[PDB]
């Protein structure tokens, strides 16, 4: 209902916590040209030796993908050099981070929610097809995430620019509210409620996860499908009498065997090249996703973000990272206005021929009076000379009303 003298202010606010998932890298593989194409025979190797340097070219490409994988993981996680630790004292003004802090009881130093994420991707060597270990073991990534969490909760953003400065948690939350245009006393007069809201939200996340991870699953499925096709492709004739080079070492002499060995060579080269190309394209895609994930890590977590819809829906308050197999998970804590009420408005108030405007609020009237309040939260206050500012004469403004400004000086002059 749009009317030229009507606005609708909220009254109540609701916290929320929402998850987000991103892939960061894949599983590194390396392949042997000679073992795949020729098996083990000397004759096949001798015949291939003159095709070209395609094998070497392939190996260079695959190793290139291999090293980019380590760079992606390094970039997304290794953003802190000091491995901070949380103090044993747990007093954060009523907040409760039991769930997403490290629990020192389990062997792998993984938090509760990290552990739940781990047990949802169950994942669903004898041909020259090798897989290789990543550079960082999962405990190292766990340590990195724990360090980031400690940094945010005990130092705000100030550890991401220089030395880690401590500051209580209530005032960190107060500053974060002030950064979205809601004054501090709003937080202070309601701390117990924000605390309960946050606890309930994190509990609901913990429940919902234990029910969802398609984005992290598709990578594994694509990998496995590609390897199975590349391996199953070894049982076709490609135009020969048989698909085993041992079936051709016998029953033939070199002169008329070499043509069928030729046909098999051609087939298997073509299969290898298709595999390599599709792998290159996939790697480029994952590279794009990993750059985006690093950016989220460095803007949402290290400091507060302000560009809409970049760290969750609603005004952004903070975030917490968590790990997952071959990927990262974000928990965005954000803020939402709840309960609306309609009020009548007016741009300026003309006390005595002077157009008074609000410094940072907006004028509202419940029908009987005029108050001026902040934009995002209904909190009436009385018009004073300490609350507005003047300009011109009240004759050019399209909308003007008639009210008196209190001006707290005259009564005190006695």
């Amino acid at each position: 209902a749009y009317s030229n003298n009507s606005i609708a202010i909220p009254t109540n606010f609701t916290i929320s916590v929402t998850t987000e998932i991103l892939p960061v890298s894949m599983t590194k593989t390396s392949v042997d040209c000679t073992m795949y194409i020729c098996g083990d025979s000397t004759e096949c190797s001798n015949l291939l030796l003159q095709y070209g340097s395609f094998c070497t070219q392939l190996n260079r490409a695959l190793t290139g993908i291999a090293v980019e994988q380590d760079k992606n993981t390094q970039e997304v996680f290794a953003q802190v050099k000091q491995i901070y630790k949380t103090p044993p004292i747990k007093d954060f003004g009523g907040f409760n981070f039991s769930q997403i802090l490290p629990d020192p009881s389990k062997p792998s130093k993984r938090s509760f929610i990290e552990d739940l994420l781990f047990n949802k991707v169950t994942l669903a060597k004898f041909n020259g097809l090798t897989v290789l270990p990543p550079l960082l073991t999962d405990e190292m990534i766990a340590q990195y995430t724990s360090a980031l969490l400690a940094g945010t909760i005990t130092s705000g953003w100030t550890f991401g620019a220089g030395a880690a400065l401590q500051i209580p948690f209530a005032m960190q939350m107060a500053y974060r509210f002030n950064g979205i245009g809601v004054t501090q006393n709003v937080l202070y007069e309601n701390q117990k409620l924000i605390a309960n809201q946050f606890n309930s939200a994190i509990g609901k996340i913990q429940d919902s996860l234990s029910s969802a991870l398609g984005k992290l699953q598709d990578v594994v499925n694509q990998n496995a499908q590609a390897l199975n096709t590349l391996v199953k492709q070894l049982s076709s004739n490609f135009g020969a009498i048989s698909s085993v080079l041992n079936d051709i070492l016998s029953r033939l002499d070199p002169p008329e065997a070499e043509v069928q060995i030729d046909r098999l060579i051609t087939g298997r080269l073509q299969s290898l090249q298709t595999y390599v190309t599709q792998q290159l394209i996939r790697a480029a895609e994952i590279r794009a996703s990993a750059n985006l994930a690093a950016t989220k890590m460095s803007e949402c977590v290290l400091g507060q973000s302000k560009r809409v819809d970049f760290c969750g829906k609603g005004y952004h308050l903070m975030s917490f990272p968590q790990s997952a197999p071959h990927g990262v998970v974000f928990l965005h804590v954000t803020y939402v206005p709840a309960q609306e009420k309609n009020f009548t408005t007016a741009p300026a108030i003309c006390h005595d021929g002077k157009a008074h405007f609000p410094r940072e609020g907006v004028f509202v009237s419940n029908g009987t009076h005029w108050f001026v309040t902040q934009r995002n939260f209904y909190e009436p206050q009385i018009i004073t000379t300490d609350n507005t500012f003047v300009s011109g004469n009240c004759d050019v403004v399209i909308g003007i009303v008639n009210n008196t400004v209190y001006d707290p000086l005259q009564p005190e002059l006695d």
Binding site: D70, A78, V80, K81, Q82, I83, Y84, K85, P87, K125, T130, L132, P133, P134, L135, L136, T137, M140, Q143, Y144, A147, A150, T154, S155, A164, Q166
Partner: protein, 66 residues
């Protein structure tokens, strides 16, 4: 130099240190932990810091308590 036989059990031989990356030959194992100089794999790095080659476990960084 140092040599690395990936994917092979150290006991099977074609200074030996068994890493998950593969039997490593020609280098020495220590107990310290410094920055990673060159990556071997599976959380193990190596360097020519001390002169012979050493293979150590990378350490993320210095520690403090705010």
């Amino acid at each position: 130099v140092a040599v690395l036989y990936q994917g092979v059990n150290c006991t099977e031989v074609p200074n030996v240190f068994q890493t998950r990356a593969g039997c490593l030959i020609g280098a020495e194992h220590v107990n310290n932990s410094y920055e990673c100089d060159i990556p071997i794999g599976a959380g193990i790095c190596a360097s020519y810091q001390t002169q012979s080659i050493i293979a150590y476990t990378m350490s993320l960084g210095a520690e403090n308590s705010v």
